[model samples]
Target: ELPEDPRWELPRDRLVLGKPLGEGCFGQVVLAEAIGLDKDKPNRVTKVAVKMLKSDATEKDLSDLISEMEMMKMIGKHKNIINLLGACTQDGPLYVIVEYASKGNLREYLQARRPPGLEYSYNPSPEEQLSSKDLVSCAYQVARGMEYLASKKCIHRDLAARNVLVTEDNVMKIADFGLPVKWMAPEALFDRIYTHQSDVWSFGVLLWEIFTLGGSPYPGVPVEELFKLLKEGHRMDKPSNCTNELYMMMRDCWHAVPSQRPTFKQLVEDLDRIVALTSNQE
Candidate 1:
């Protein structure tokens, strides 16, 4: 996590802006800019994303919400992950502050160039063709970030394109940990119990997201049927042009026994090799 700023210690009316970057039922995200910057600093406008808990949030919901913020605060500073700017809870409202993402969520970034619902239709337009190198690079960055989380015994329950923020330079960072927790057993997908293995499962789903360039996972599988399908040994369908090694890694992640899944350390190595070969970095 980024170091705490000594400047505005209290969370007050600093400067509110226009529409939010993103929001959900439990919380709302808004764009804010810092009032001042260091002298002679090249970048002036310090844009940030702030999230506040909704007024009607429940006890359980608040706990999970705080947990997610704490986790982000804990892991925000490590290069591959987004930097945590600051936070506020001094006032009646509680909020989190993090670096702004210019390109927005990966899903929105990809959708802007494609037809609605065409993601599931498997028809790729000419402009939709992103090089395999770019795809692998994204995978590499995610794995590197996950490897860091694993080192700290942290597990991200939700890993998907919507939770990944991209920058104009094509750099990626993991975000939206409202569902973050310790890994859990495969059987405990509904219940809460975190473990490193469950994170692998999430990573597998994330892999599907990157390969399809923001395509929805299990497009036709209803939430009610997810548990049954998982119990019945069903996994997401492999994406087109996905490497065999990549498929194997994702398959192992969704293995019935969480213990059988590879650790993030292992994943990092695998992804690094993949990226190196794909980018000729080796």
Candidate 2:
């Protein structure tokens, strides 16, 4: 579904943001607002994310842009997924409007926090330190988000530590669908096919990221060299604080055969059980 124009559906005189929320491979995300909305409810203030295309984008980049929009329009409404507010293409520049997440992406959050016993540019309060329990809770939230995405028959191909964004209340939402793949079984990973099952594979990596406090999944390994290592049965080592069940679940996610992996429904159930156990222990 190629958009007729380069811009999204934004109206005239819309308020562009003062600073960008974040920047990525394609464009910069700025915080914007749609004018003329209901004033009664404060929630109706209506924050929108605008992705302005880079000025030097080539023809191939343009095609990729269209692909992203088509995919977004296809699966933009699931509760746990980020919302696509609309696009604005009527003007000279292209602007893709999406739902604004106030807390920013998880990767940024982790990077901003200082490591224990490390000197930092800025001083953080001792209370800001993260605990083992916090890591487990964050991992559970990410799993819950993926569970919702799987229920809708969508697979986020790039489910990494950085992509999950959290809200003020610690609610995590899955965003960045530019690289989503249709659902599939675990055996499909050998073929390099992206499926819902492959998402589980990535989810395992994500779990590794959380448990390691955003450490590199394959430390000292180059991208071009990873497939060969994976083919040789290489998997992440268990983190110090990770439980046996969590380790087992991550191992299953990266199983040699995709069909052997648990389904999203099973994932939700397992995560729920783990959370229940943690609560009981408390």
Candidate 3:
């Protein structure tokens, strides 16, 4: 299923795979270094994140991996979204190279930079401390990325996961995939229906994760109890650190009807407004 596009095709010999960042039943993601991605820069070796399959991956998994790469290639590039760099599908353990997020996953990053009052045995180091403004900026950046995704007709069903990635310069990039039970909207949870609206709802949950500084949504509630609570018009409370304005957005994201949830475009504007207003206070 690898695309015939020569631009995305890379020679198998140039890759130097490092430790597996994550491994699962079907595939694994690894940190890798590629030499000479740029034909003009023959001496340059670049660090990249590579998604590939295990030694015994089935034919279906191979198709799916290439399918994802093809879609990402068509989706083009954005700063807030991980861009496909190249592919090495001509040989075994087919590689889908993407930009490496230097700061790693957002939830872990936020937890590392935990401000005062968040429940954790850990205290942030001086360099790890993030101001409240930094938090809001993260949300804003995600909203911007999501807006681009929506416009491109891409549904990021797993935005609700604590898996947004951060770059060295502090940019937020959407990194996670798959629709986990905790991240699903009402329609998606029951019917397995996925729509842009559902993704919009997921972004709200993502916001909750960000605002809570990696705290799980509905802490202490079981999945069964969660369904019941949601049916009864219950939503998670705002974290002590979150503002009422941001919480209101989350409430709207969980609105009783799908139509009531704001679209990603609107969320971008709304977040922009919040960022502007908050910055004035500084």
Candidate topping lDDT: 3
Instruction: Let me know the TM-score candidate 3 reaches against the reference structure.
Output: 0.90
Q: What is the overall TM-score of model 2 with all chains considered together?
A: 0.80
Q: In model 1, which residue pairs have backbone atoms overlapping below 3 Å?
A: 182-194, 182-195, 183-194, 183-195, 184-195
lDDT of 2 by residue, 31-102 (tens): 888753333553445677777667777777767766777677766475456767767666566667777777
Candidate 2 runs further than 4 Å off: 1-8, 23-25, 36-44, 111-115, 118-127, 131-133, 180-190, 222-225, 279-282
Predicted structure 1, TM vs. truth: 0.78
- By lDDT, highest first, what's the ranking? 3, 1, 2
Q: Write the per-residue lDDT of candidate 3 for residues 94-179, one digit (tens) a residue.
A: 78899998777887787777756645524353236666677788999998888887788888887853568888899998864321
- Measured with C-alpha atoms, the lDDT of residue 53 in candidate 3 is 79
C-alpha lDDT score of every prediction, in listed order: 0.69, 0.67, 0.79
Residue 157 C-alpha lDDT in model 2 = 78
Backbone Cα, N, C clashes tallied per candidate:
5, 13, 0
Candidate 3's error at 116, in angstroms? 6.8
RMSD of 3: 2.6
RMSD of each: 4.8, 4.7, 2.6
Q: How does each model score on TM-score?
A: 0.78, 0.80, 0.90
